[PDB]
Design a protein around this ligand. Structure first.
Ligand SMILES: *[C@H](CS(=O)(=O)c1ccccn1)[C@H](CCc1ccccc1)NC(=O)[C@H](Cc1ccc(O)cc1)NC(=O)N1CCC(C(=O)OCC)CC1
Length: 254
């Protein structure tokens, strides 16, 4: 197929509100899980013709997947998509919107930036308990509310493969290396210039473009809408910048 020089998942599939939805992991290293349930949410809408147009529970994946790592202290991407395939994940929204089977237990906060939420600070909450019981308000039982995928795969570390995957099947989950200068990102096309290795961050790639010939990925972060470019950022594409093309992870409902 032909690869357009620019692509936005939001514009291809605007009926799928989840694609334009920026989330907040709060005081928890639950990025890995957010990136998973965000892209799963998108892909469930894209691939089911809207039949499943849902907001999948971040906390449900966080607390119940035993094979997915250290929960709020960090997680493993491939295992999260495997769990979605094998057990499925229920619906569940933010703590503030309290919708779905299992809403997020943690409140929104500001991540190394200014805005309308209290600051996140540097503390980390304890990984929530696996509950398997929808809120009283919600009218589907837990086991019934499970949304499963059918496949779970790594995407090849190739710009052109990642592009075709997103454009055909929807947004993907990706891993990249956080250096200290990323935490000061306000706007523009990010690339590492200064700062020590801090860790690894798991986000959602929704498309790409160019800005005066500069190739970039378009990425939804999970640090609320006040962070960065109304919750998104862009980053250098095609150079494996901060390993952004190296652990692309997705799957399909068929
Ligand atoms: C999210 C990144 S963050 O920037 O939002 C953040 C950073 C620090 C605190 C809170 N949020 C999380 C942060 C986890 C963390 C928590 C406390 C202290 C330090 C870090 N990051 C992850 O979940 C990464 C995601 C990732 C995976 C793969 C990849 O190529 C890039 C990024 N994964 C981890 O942190 N892991 C640590 C524990 C590992 C594990 O389970 O060990 C085996 C049992 C899994 C990987």
């Amino acid at each position: 197929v032909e690869i357009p020089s620019s692509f936005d998942s939001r514009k291809k599939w605007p009926r799928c509100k989840s694609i334009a939805t920026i989330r907040d992991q709060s005081r928890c290293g639950s990025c890995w899980a957010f990136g998973a349930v965000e892209a799963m949410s998108d892909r469930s809408c894209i691939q089911s013709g809207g039949k499943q147009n849902v907001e999948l529970s971040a906390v449900d994946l966080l607390s119940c997947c035993e094979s997915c790592g250290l929960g709020c202290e960090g997680g493993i991407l491939g295992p999260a998509w495997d769990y979605w395939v094998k057990e499925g994940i229920v619906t569940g929204s933010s703590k503030e919107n309290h919708a779905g089977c299992e809403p997020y237990p943690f409140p929104k906060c500001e991540h190394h930036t200014k805005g309308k939420y209290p600051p996140c600070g540097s503390k980390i909450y304890k990984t929530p308990r696996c509950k398997q019981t929808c809120q009283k308000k919600y009218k589907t039982p837990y086991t019934q509310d499970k949304h499963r995928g059918k496949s779970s795969y790594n995407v090849k570390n190739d710009e052109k493969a990642i592009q075709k995957e997103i454009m055909k099947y929807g947004p993907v989950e990706a891993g990249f290396t956080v250096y200290e200068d990323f935490l000061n990102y306000k706007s523009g096309i990010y690339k590492h210039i200064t700062g020590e290795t801090l860790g690894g961050h798991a986000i959602r790639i929704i498309g790409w473009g160019v800005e005066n010939k500069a190739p970039y990925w378009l990425i939804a972060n999970s640090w609320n809408e006040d962070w960065g470019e109304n919750g998104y950022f862009r980053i250098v594409r095609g150079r494996d910048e901060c390993s952004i093309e190296s652990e692309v992870t997705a799957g399909r409902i068929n």
